[PDB]
Design an enzyme around this catalytic site. Structure first.
Site, PDB file in Angstrom:
ATOM      1  N   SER A 145      16.894 -78.467 -25.824  1.00  9.62           N
ATOM      2  CA  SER A 145      17.508 -77.984 -24.584  1.00  9.62           C
ATOM      3  C   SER A 145      19.035 -77.956 -24.705  1.00  9.62           C
ATOM      4  O   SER A 145      19.610 -78.797 -25.400  1.00  9.62           O
ATOM      5  CB  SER A 145      17.104 -78.837 -23.383  1.00  9.62           C
ATOM      6  OG  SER A 145      16.557 -80.093 -23.728  1.00  9.62           O
ATOM      7  N   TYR A 146      19.685 -76.963 -24.070  1.00  5.01           N
ATOM      8  CA  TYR A 146      21.142 -76.861 -24.040  1.00  5.01           C
ATOM      9  C   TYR A 146      21.649 -77.651 -22.826  1.00  5.01           C
ATOM     10  O   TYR A 146      21.144 -77.476 -21.712  1.00  5.01           O
ATOM     11  CB  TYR A 146      21.584 -75.386 -23.986  1.00  5.01           C
ATOM     12  CG  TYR A 146      23.077 -75.108 -23.863  1.00  5.01           C
ATOM     13  CD1 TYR A 146      24.013 -75.859 -24.576  1.00  5.01           C
ATOM     14  CD2 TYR A 146      23.545 -74.036 -23.104  1.00  5.01           C
ATOM     15  CE1 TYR A 146      25.376 -75.571 -24.505  1.00  5.01           C
ATOM     16  CE2 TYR A 146      24.906 -73.745 -23.023  1.00  5.01           C
ATOM     17  CZ  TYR A 146      25.814 -74.508 -23.731  1.00  5.01           C
ATOM     18  OH  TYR A 146      27.149 -74.213 -23.630  1.00  5.01           O
ATOM     19  N   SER A 192      25.706 -87.598 -38.471  1.00  2.64           N
ATOM     20  CA  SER A 192      25.946 -88.216 -39.778  1.00  2.64           C
ATOM     21  C   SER A 192      25.455 -87.339 -40.940  1.00  2.64           C
ATOM     22  O   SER A 192      26.063 -87.356 -42.013  1.00  2.64           O
ATOM     23  CB  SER A 192      25.305 -89.603 -39.832  1.00  2.64           C
ATOM     24  OG  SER A 192      24.065 -89.635 -39.139  1.00  2.64           O
ATOM     25  N   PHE A 193      24.363 -86.566 -40.711  1.00  2.00           N
ATOM     26  CA  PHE A 193      23.718 -85.673 -41.684  1.00  2.00           C
ATOM     27  C   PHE A 193      23.200 -84.377 -41.037  1.00  2.00           C
ATOM     28  O   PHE A 193      22.416 -83.646 -41.657  1.00  2.00           O
ATOM     29  CB  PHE A 193      22.575 -86.419 -42.420  1.00  2.00           C
ATOM     30  CG  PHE A 193      21.561 -87.127 -41.555  1.00  2.00           C
ATOM     31  CD1 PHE A 193      20.431 -86.458 -41.086  1.00  2.00           C
ATOM     32  CD2 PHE A 193      21.715 -88.473 -41.232  1.00  2.00           C
ATOM     33  CE1 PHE A 193      19.491 -87.115 -40.282  1.00  2.00           C
ATOM     34  CE2 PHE A 193      20.779 -89.129 -40.423  1.00  2.00           C
ATOM     35  CZ  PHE A 193      19.667 -88.447 -39.962  1.00  2.00           C
ATOM     36  N   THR A 223      26.533 -98.373 -32.425  1.00  2.00           N
ATOM     37  CA  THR A 223      27.985 -98.315 -32.204  1.00  2.00           C
ATOM     38  C   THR A 223      28.475 -99.706 -31.832  1.00  2.00           C
ATOM     39  O   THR A 223      27.859-100.371 -30.998  1.00  2.00           O
ATOM     40  CB  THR A 223      28.322 -97.219 -31.196  1.00  2.00           C
ATOM     41  OG1 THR A 223      27.802 -96.014 -31.721  1.00  2.00           O
ATOM     42  CG2 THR A 223      29.801 -97.039 -30.982  1.00  2.00           C
ATOM     43  N   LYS A 252      25.062 -94.800 -25.664  1.00  2.00           N
ATOM     44  CA  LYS A 252      26.506 -94.741 -25.445  1.00  2.00           C
ATOM     45  C   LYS A 252      26.882 -93.431 -24.726  1.00  2.00           C
ATOM     46  O   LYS A 252      26.087 -92.486 -24.775  1.00  2.00           O
ATOM     47  CB  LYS A 252      27.261 -94.859 -26.798  1.00  2.00           C
ATOM     48  CG  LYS A 252      26.835 -93.824 -27.822  1.00  2.00           C
ATOM     49  CD  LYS A 252      27.494 -94.039 -29.130  1.00  2.00           C
ATOM     50  CE  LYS A 252      26.821 -93.187 -30.163  1.00  2.00           C
ATOM     51  NZ  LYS A 252      27.529 -93.271 -31.456  1.00  2.00           N
ATOM     52  N   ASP A 285      21.099 -97.166 -29.670  1.00  2.00           N
ATOM     53  CA  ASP A 285      22.443 -96.603 -29.846  1.00  2.00           C
ATOM     54  C   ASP A 285      22.884 -95.837 -28.594  1.00  2.00           C
ATOM     55  O   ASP A 285      23.496 -94.765 -28.681  1.00  2.00           O
ATOM     56  CB  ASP A 285      22.537 -95.731 -31.114  1.00  2.00           C
ATOM     57  CG  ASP A 285      23.942 -95.544 -31.666  1.00  2.00           C
ATOM     58  OD1 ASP A 285      24.844 -96.337 -31.292  1.00  2.00           O
ATOM     59  OD2 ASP A 285      24.135 -94.629 -32.491  1.00  2.00           O
TER      60      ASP A 285
HETATM   61  C1  LIG Z   1      24.781 -86.553 -29.386  1.00  2.00           C
HETATM   62  C2  LIG Z   1      25.001 -85.188 -30.107  1.00  2.00           C
HETATM   63  N1  LIG Z   1      25.826 -84.255 -29.296  1.00  2.00           N
HETATM   64  C3  LIG Z   1      25.214 -83.169 -28.601  1.00  2.00           C
HETATM   65  N2  LIG Z   1      23.852 -82.984 -28.767  1.00  2.00           N
HETATM   66  C4  LIG Z   1      23.161 -81.998 -28.082  1.00  2.00           C
HETATM   67  C5  LIG Z   1      23.809 -81.060 -27.220  1.00  2.00           C
HETATM   68  C6  LIG Z   1      25.245 -81.150 -27.083  1.00  2.00           C
HETATM   69  C7  LIG Z   1      26.024 -80.205 -26.323  1.00  2.00           C
HETATM   70  C8  LIG Z   1      27.417 -80.321 -26.289  1.00  2.00           C
HETATM   71  C9  LIG Z   1      28.159 -79.316 -25.629  1.00  2.00           C
HETATM   72  C10 LIG Z   1      27.887 -78.423 -24.557  1.00  2.00           C
HETATM   73  N3  LIG Z   1      28.943 -77.600 -24.340  1.00  2.00           N
HETATM   74  N4  LIG Z   1      29.851 -77.980 -25.301  1.00  2.00           N
HETATM   75  C11 LIG Z   1      29.440 -78.975 -26.102  1.00  2.00           C
HETATM   76  C12 LIG Z   1      28.084 -81.377 -26.948  1.00  2.00           C
HETATM   77  C13 LIG Z   1      27.359 -82.340 -27.676  1.00  2.00           C
HETATM   78  C14 LIG Z   1      25.958 -82.244 -27.780  1.00  2.00           C
HETATM   79  C15 LIG Z   1      22.931 -80.074 -26.504  1.00  2.00           C
HETATM   80  O1  LIG Z   1      23.358 -79.286 -25.714  1.00  2.00           O
HETATM   81  N5  LIG Z   1      21.571 -80.163 -26.691  1.00  2.00           N
HETATM   82  C16 LIG Z   1      20.985 -81.040 -27.603  1.00  2.00           C
HETATM   83  C17 LIG Z   1      21.715 -81.985 -28.292  1.00  2.00           C
HETATM   84  C18 LIG Z   1      21.125 -82.869 -29.249  1.00  2.00           C
HETATM   85  C19 LIG Z   1      20.618 -83.628 -30.072  1.00  2.00           C
HETATM   86  C20 LIG Z   1      20.012 -84.600 -30.987  1.00  2.00           C
HETATM   87  C21 LIG Z   1      20.333 -84.643 -32.436  1.00  2.00           C
HETATM   88  C22 LIG Z   1      21.010 -85.611 -31.547  1.00  2.00           C
HETATM   89  C23 LIG Z   1      25.352 -85.169 -31.661  1.00  2.00           C
HETATM   90  C24 LIG Z   1      26.902 -85.246 -31.894  1.00  2.00           C
HETATM   91  C25 LIG Z   1      24.642 -86.289 -32.437  1.00  2.00           C
HETATM   92  C26 LIG Z   1      24.859 -83.836 -32.264  1.00  2.00           C
END
Ligand SMILES: C[C@@H](Nc1nc2c(c3cc(-c4cn[nH]c4)ccc13)C(=O)N=CC2=CCC1CC1)C(C)(C)C
Length: 279
Positions: A85-86, A17-18, A162, A132, A130
């Site tokens: 972490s990735y 969102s930000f 959501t 989901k 939240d």
């Molecule tokens: C839920 C979140 N989505 C995601 N948050 C994280 C990822 C992440 C990786 C992929 C991915 C891997 N390969 N391709 C895409 C797609 C979506 C991701 C990651 O690797 N490590 C930490 C994360 C997270 C963080 C925390 C702030 C919420 C939003 C959309 C809110 C950023």
């Protein structure tokens, strides 16, 4: 004591969102991190600091294989950065969209991993609020990595998650409990089996109406044990949901026939099944 220059920023993984989460490689080590970037100006302007603080607070408390880990934090003149972490395999939603209805083996394994992660979270007095498929991520090994804690609730009335996964108490009484996450779990199990969430309508007003009225239907195909579990989670009264305090906790939920063959101890050490469709 890192700075933005220590990393080579790559592909955008996701957007908030930000905020924005970018894949970054550390120059020195060659190590990959998912760095969450927030524009300071925007966070100050929109009064978003308590969300940043909540995520910082929540994430620093967790140490579990099923949660995205916060490694470090730094900032420059414009931006605030969080080294996380990735989760190489992206969102669990991406696989729900890719394959549709999952088989029983897959549903059971992933549901068990989410149940196991919620037990950890709830035992630390934190409510996600939240939960989901979009924020249940998958690492290289295909193990869940739960994330998105800016809107979580720490125990020792605000936010609505959501619309498809909101508990009836959150809509009516405005207050979430650990049991609110069990309602989201019921919605997630249904979604894995059916390929769609239980509450579907033209708009958010119409979804909320179906939630408060427990207006959902099971498809014919639906696994009998998974259907029983979903009926025991999607209960209007939050004190009658399988897994809550009033219901004797996690043990009877882990004991449900749907989890027969699940070894609860060290699920993160078990090889996940290959994701297969059920037609
Ligand atoms: C839920 C979140 N989505 C995601 N948050 C994280 C990822 C992440 C990786 C992929 C991915 C891997 N390969 N391709 C895409 C797609 C979506 C991701 C990651 O690797 N490590 C930490 C994360 C997270 C963080 C925390 C702030 C919420 C939003 C959309 C809110 C950023």
């Amino acid at each position: 004591k890192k700075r933005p220059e220590d990393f080579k920023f790559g592909k955008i993984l996701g957007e908030g969102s930000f905020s924005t989460v970018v894949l970054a490689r550390e120059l020195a080590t060659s190590r990959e991190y998912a760095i969450k970037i927030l524009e300071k100006r925007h966070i100050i302007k929109e009064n978003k600091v308590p969300y940043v603080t909540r995520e910082r607070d929540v994430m620093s408390r967790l140490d579990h294989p099923f949660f995205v880990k916060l490694y470090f934090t730094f900032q420059d003149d414009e931006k605030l950065y969080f080294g996380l972490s990735y989760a190489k395999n992206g969102e669990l939603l991406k696989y729900i969209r890719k394959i549709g209805s999952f088989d029983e083996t897959c549903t059971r394994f992933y549901t068990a991993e989410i149940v196991s992660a919620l037990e950890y979270l709830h035992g630390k007095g934190i409510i996600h609020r939240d939960l989901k498929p979009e924020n249940i991520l998958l690492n290289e090994d295909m193990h869940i990595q739960i994330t998105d804690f800016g809107t979580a609730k720490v125990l020792s009335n605000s936010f609505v998650g959501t619309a498809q996964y909101v508990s009836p108490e959150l809509l009516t009484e405005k207050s979430a409990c650990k049991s609110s996450d069990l309602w989201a779990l019921g919605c997630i199990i249904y979604q894995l089996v059916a390929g769609l969430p239980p509450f579907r309508a033209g708009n958010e007003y119409l979804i909320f109406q179906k939630i408060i009225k427990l207006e959902y239907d099971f498809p014919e195909k639906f696994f009998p044990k998974a259907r029983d579990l979903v009926e025991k989670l999607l209960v209007l009264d939050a004190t009658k949901r399988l897994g809550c305090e009033e219901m004797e906790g996690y043990g009877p939920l882990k004991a449900h026939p749907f989890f027969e063959s699940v070894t609860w101890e060290n699920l993160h050490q078990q090889t996940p099944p290959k994701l297969t469709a059920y037609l």
